[PDB]
Every structure is written in structure tokens, then in C-alpha cells.
Amino acid sequence: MKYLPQQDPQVFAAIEQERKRQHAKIELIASENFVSRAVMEAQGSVLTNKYAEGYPGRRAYGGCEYVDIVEELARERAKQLFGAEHANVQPHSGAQANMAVYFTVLEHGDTVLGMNLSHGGHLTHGSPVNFSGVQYNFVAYGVDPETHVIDYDDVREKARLHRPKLIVAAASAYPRIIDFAKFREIADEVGAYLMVDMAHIAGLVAAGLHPNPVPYAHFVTTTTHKTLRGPRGGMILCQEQFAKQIDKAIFPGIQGGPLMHVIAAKAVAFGEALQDDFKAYAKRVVDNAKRLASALQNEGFTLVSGGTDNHLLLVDLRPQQLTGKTAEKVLDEVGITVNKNTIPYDPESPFVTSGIRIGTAAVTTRGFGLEEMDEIAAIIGLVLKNVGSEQALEEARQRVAALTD
Amino acid sequence: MKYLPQQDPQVFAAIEQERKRQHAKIELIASENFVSRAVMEAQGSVLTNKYAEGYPGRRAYGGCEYVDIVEELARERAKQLFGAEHANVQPHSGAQANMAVYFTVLEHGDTVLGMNLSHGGHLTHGSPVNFSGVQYNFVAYGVDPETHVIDYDDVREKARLHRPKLIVAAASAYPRIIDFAKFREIADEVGAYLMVDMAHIAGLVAAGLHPNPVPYAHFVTTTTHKTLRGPRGGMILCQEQFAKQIDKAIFPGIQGGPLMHVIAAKAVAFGEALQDDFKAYAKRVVDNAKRLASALQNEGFTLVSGGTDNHLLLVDLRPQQLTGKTAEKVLDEVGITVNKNTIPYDPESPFVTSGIRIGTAAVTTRGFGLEEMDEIAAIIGLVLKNVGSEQALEEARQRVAALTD
Numbered sequence A, B: 001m002k003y004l005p006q007q008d009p010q011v012f013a014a015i016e017q018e019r020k021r022q023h024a025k026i027e028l029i030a031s032e033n034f035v036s037r038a039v040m041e042a043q044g045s046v047l048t049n050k051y052a053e054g055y056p057g058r059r060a061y062g063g064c065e066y067v068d069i070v071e072e073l074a075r076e077r078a079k080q081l082f083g084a085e086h087a088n089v090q091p092h093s094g095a096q097a098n099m100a101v102y103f104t105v106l107e108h109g110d111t112v113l114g115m116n117l118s119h120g121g122h123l124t125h126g127s128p129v130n131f132s133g134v135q136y137n138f139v140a141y142g143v144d145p146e147t148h149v150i151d152y153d154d155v156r157e158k159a160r161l162h163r164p165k166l167i168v169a170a171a172s173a174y175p176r177i178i179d180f181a182k183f184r185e186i187a188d189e190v191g192a193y194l195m196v197d198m199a200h201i202a203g204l205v206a207a208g209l210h211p212n213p214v215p216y217a218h219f220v221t222t223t224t225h226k227t228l229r230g231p232r233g234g235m236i237l238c239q240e241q242f243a244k245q246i247d248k249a250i251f252p253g254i255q256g257g258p259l260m261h262v263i264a265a266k267a268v269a270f271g272e273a274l275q276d277d278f279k280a281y282a283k284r285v286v287d288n289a290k291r292l293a294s295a296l297q298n299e300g301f302t303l304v305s306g307g308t309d310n311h312l313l314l315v316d317l318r319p320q321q322l323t324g325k326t327a328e329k330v331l332d333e334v335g336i337t338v339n340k341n342t343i344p345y346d347p348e349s350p351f352v353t354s355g356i357r358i359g360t361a362a363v364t365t366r367g368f369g370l371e372e373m374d375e376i377a378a379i380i381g382l383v384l385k386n387v388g389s390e391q392a393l394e395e396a397r398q399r400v401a402a403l404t405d
Helices: A009-024 A037-043 A065-082 A094-105 A131-135 A152-162 A180-190 A202-206 A240-254 A260-274 A276-298 A324-334 A361-365 A370-384 A390-404 B009-024 B037-043 B065-082 B094-105 B131-135 B152-162 B180-190 B202-206 B240-254 B260-274 B276-298 B324-334 B361-365 B370-384 B390-404
Strands: A086-088 A111-115 A137-141 A166-169 A193-197 A219-223 A234-238 A312-316 A355-359 B086-088 B111-115 B137-141 B166-169 B193-197 B219-223 B234-238 B312-316 B355-359
Touching (some): A009 B065, A009 B260, A037 A260, A065 A234, A166 A180, A180 A193, A202 A276, A276 A361, A370 A390, B009 B390, B037 B260, B065 B086, B065 B234, B065 B260, B086 B240, B234 B240, B276 B312, B276 B361, B276 B370
Parallel strands (some): A111 A137
Antiparallel strands (some): A219 A234
């Protein structure tokens, strides 16, 4: 940076701390990643100065010729990546992408069926303290108590009982492949739209390592930030038949001016995802998650679902008589970043939990491989088996430092 | 830029075009500005990598120590700038800031009173194709047909008749000072909350050149991008009594993860606004608008309200027998960026209009003064009085180029 250090020492000092923290810690929060310098440069561009309400070639204001080129690049690259008939790259966030789909197909009070929040579903899939739960009547399907895999007969029974106008599939903490074909079959049976929120798995989908929801879903929502390793924001994919409605839901429906600089950054991230080396990266993500899962089991940990098909895993800490909250805290002490996370049928509150969620996207981006997964698992075992030994925590601290350099 | 040119030639070429366009044109769109290099650097930082759901010291996830410092800096600087008891710097946009206030105080179907959209009100103040108009029952107050000043007796009568739960004041195209004291008096009479959307005038308010709504409003919403000359985003200000509710409306209410990099950029912009030279800048904005208004009248143009108290003016093109659409198009041909804008009691549709809206924030940032205002007015006169003369348009084109260098 050149101008920020001089203009704002306070802001600069804090950013630099954050930059150094990102390097020093082992980042295992499943939704996180590190974007490229190209992505950040696009975000740091003069495109923040441009009002561009509307869409390419159909804007509210003049002078949008060049931001139109940027947006179209984002849209066309998104369609190439995912094989969608239409893309809307304007949503400010995953929240707003979901919001716009709901605005499109639902009236206030309509019934929606989504994944149980304590089994892996997102806040925006019907939390009673979120707009989704307040605005619409959400019902929930669950995972099997033993396998922790989505019970598709439960999805079906809930759909046939509650007659949702919309079914939502996808999750913030589900470690297995979702069967979108079965979701669509159930949707078709009850005459419901199917929305897939692929936020967590979008990078895996782009790389062909998770089945693509696009052929099965009327609407696919996603974040761009994350397995897709883009800037922070949202996107909606859909068939051409809903394109006009989806675009109108975003604007003038729920947003105003789009963030053209972030849209530029999205285009850059999609470009990166289209390359062969992103596919290799994504395979290492999944390989690393599998390896880390296996290594954790070797250390004596129980995992939700008995492992992972994707980037993420959930440790069920009940055998160790630890809460997710306790685990999160102690791991923080040694420089490992996780989050407490409810496990299916969790006897503890969402503020305490019996689990920790772990993902490999971030560490894989940093160049971590299988050997690093083994060591991370060994460090976690050392810490969680010795929460009362400061000497064990210091050893863990030193082994963490050894990994980050 | 260093990495973007190599990584993504297509995106880079388009951004560079946009950068060159921003320099070449006379930008008179009233909502637009040019941010500092410090602001853009903050936006281009590694803070995009951090999930920071929740608030400073009370986050969902660990590792937020430094992003907490950034957010608190934004919040405290906002409070210093505007004298508010509480700030929420997380809204992704002006749309989402407004959305969150509505989510806080209103139930679905509640009556809201806002400014007539064709008299200056915003899309998010009750458009039937916007969430505001779809979710709540909006009624409208108007300006006087002769003076084009808000009819405060009309605000009062509409409030007493319709019994709104919320009254909204402020505008996207109102060239006069708004009387917030009178709005609060009316609000108090009918037992309604008062929300002020100061998006357009927030920079003027910070500089003491427009009366501050904060002492009179329960909620003040604003964009940060704009007269405040910040990054693209929103902010909510309120009294401490609504702080907890407003924060919960933003998260977990209507958003998820905030854009910490943009929040950094907001802090930087607030820092800039706190300096003496921003106050001087803002006075030049208002001085330039007054001068430009007077110079336009000298050219024979009629202005809505007979002039301006702020950064913006509206030309009523009816005396010239031109539509706003025609004016916008021809001005675009010579390198002057305006937007068509409905005038109060406009006989034309919002897609055609009888007016153009013009603001001085952007050109003032570029260093334009009174002499430049005279010339801009002379060029506009030349173009609009000779829409059929290509030679007149070429002269205008050359005089525009002379101004931008």
C-alpha cells in the first residue's frame, strides 16, 4: 500500500495486524479462503465510483459501456463454469442472493422446506431471527440419527405433509454429497420449486468434484467467497424462463446500485476457476479433507457422518466430554482457528454445541498437503486430550508456528 | 496495478477504459463522486478474507481482534461526524440500510408515509416494484406545485389521515433543505417513528452545511458513497434505545457476513470527512451548485424550486419543449453525464421525464470552481438550444475536452 499508510495510520496498523494474523494462524473455518492479488486489485479499483443500476445495455444511467463489459464477463464466465442458462452477479452477499430468490417465487407467509438448522442448514434457510423465518413459514427435514446423511424419505414426507411452495437444499455444515436429483424428484412430486444454495461447495462444483445442482434446480444461489475463492458477495443462477424475474428481484426488487468493483473481482475469480490449476487445487482441497478426517479418526475423534465427501468435516466431541465452545477456545490459544458448530441431534445449545466444524479450502490455498493434514490432526489431538496442560499447549503452539513458517 | 494486468487482460482493459472515461467526461450525476486512493486501497485489502458475522467483541467466530478495531474506528468516527448515539456500519448498501430500519420497526403491511417518488423520493421509499412498496403500505406526501418545496401541511394531513407507523423524510432529487424539526413534530403528533434517509446530503450534513437530522430522527440511514465521498455501502445511525434492535436487524436479520474491507474503507472516508479540508470541499460543492444554478438561469433554463440549497439541481425542460430523455442523450454525445429525472407533477413517464438532475459533488472533487460552473452552464445552453446542429455539438465536445484537460 502507498496512500493508506500516510492518510490513515490507525486503519493501516489494524489491516497490517490482520494481514499478519492471516499468515500466522492455521485457518480451518470452513467458509474461509485467501483470494488472489488480482482479485483484490479489482476490488480496489475506480469501479467503486460508478452508479450502474440496471443491467448491461439496459442501465438507468449513461456511461456504463465499460462496467457493462465487466459485468458481462462475470455473467458469461459464470455460465461457462456452471453451465447455467442465466447468471445474476449483482447480489451483495449470499444473504441477498437467497433473499432475491425468495422475493421472486414466494409471497409473505408461504411455506418453505429447508434443511434443519441444527443439522447443517443456514440461517437464511428459515431461522426465526432471520428475515427468512420471519417472512415465510419454514419447515425442516433432517439427517438420519445414525449416519447423519440427509433422510430423503424425511424430505419427501415433510414436502407431502406441508406442501411447500419452495424446497431449499444445501448447507453450511453438511460433510456429504447432496443428491440433487432426489430433491428435484420430491419437488416435482409436490409441485414445488427447488432452490439449491451451493455457497460452501461452489468451488467443488466448478471443478467437477461435487455433482452440479444447475441441471436439477430452478434456482441455484451461491456466495463467491468460499470454495470458489472469490471476493465476498453473492450470485444467482437459473434457467432462462426465470431470468427476467430474478433480475427484477435483485433490481429494483431488493438492491439498488451494484458493487461494480466487486463484480470485476467476481469476473477475475471466475476466470481463475476456469483454469486447469483451479481444478487441481479443488482436488487437493477434497483430498486434504479426506486425509484430515482419517488422521483425526486415527487420533481417536468421532466425525459426524463418519467422514467427508467435500471440503468440510464436523468433529462430534461428546466422546471426549468436551463442548464445541471449549474446543474452539483452547484451539484459539494455540493458533488454530475453528468454529464451534451444532452437530445433528446436539444435546447442547447453538451457543455451546457438541462439535467443531473444520474445512481445508484455506490451508490448501496456502499450499498445505497430506503431510500437513496429518500434523494438523496430531496437534488437535494433543490439544483436546490435554486441555489442562499449559506445556502441551505450548508444544502445540510451537508446532503450529512450524507449519505456518 | 501489478497482478491484474497479467492475470486477466480482459478485466484489466475494461477497468482502464473506465478509469479513462471517469477522467474524460464531465460527471454531473448527483449521486456520484471520486474516492481517494486511500479509500480504494482499504477496499483492495486482505480484509475480504475474513468472516466477521456479529459485532466487535461479540463475533460468531474467533480471530476478529483486528477487524474489530477497524469496525470500531468506523463506528466511533461516524458518531463523531454526526453526533449519533449509535452507528451500524455493516449495511451493504443504502437499500439494505433502509431495509434493516423497516425490518426493525414495521410488520408486513404496516403503513409508511414517504416522499412522492415523482417529487424526489427514492425507490426504497415505497416503489410498488421495490420490496418497500411490496412489503409495506406506502402513502406519499408532495411538494407545492408552484414552489416545489415540501408541503408540510400535506405531510401533516397524510400522516393524520393514514396514521403511518413510520414517516420517511429525505430524497434522491430534492434541491432544498429539508425541515427535520417539522417532520418530527408531525411524527410526534400521530405517534409515528421518524426515519431520515440522508444518503444524498450526508457529506453536507457532516460539514455543517445542511441541518443534521440526527437530533430529530429515531433512525438516520445513509449511503457512504455520495456527498460523503466514501466507498459504496450503507450505514444506520440511531439513539441508544434502538441500538440493540438495529444491530439485530442487520445481523442475523437481513445480512450475514459484513464486508470488512469496505468497512475499512468507510473508516478511511469518515477520517477524511473529519478533517478541515473536507469542510472546505463541501462548501465548494454547495457554492458550485448555487453558481451552476444561477448560470443555468442566465442561459434561460427553468430550475425546479427556482434554485438549490444543496449539491443538486433539477432543470425543468418544458420551456425548451425537450424531454429529459432527449437532453440526457444529446449531452452524452458531447461528454456530459447527467440523468433524466422526473420533475414534480411531470406530465411525462419516469422513462421519458421533463427534467435532468445535475449535482456538483464529483466535479468539485476534481477541483472545478465557479468559472468552471459558468462554462458548464454555457455548454449545456449551447447543446440544448441546438440539438440539431452537429457543429454546435462538436464545439461543445471541444469545450468539454478543454475543461477535463
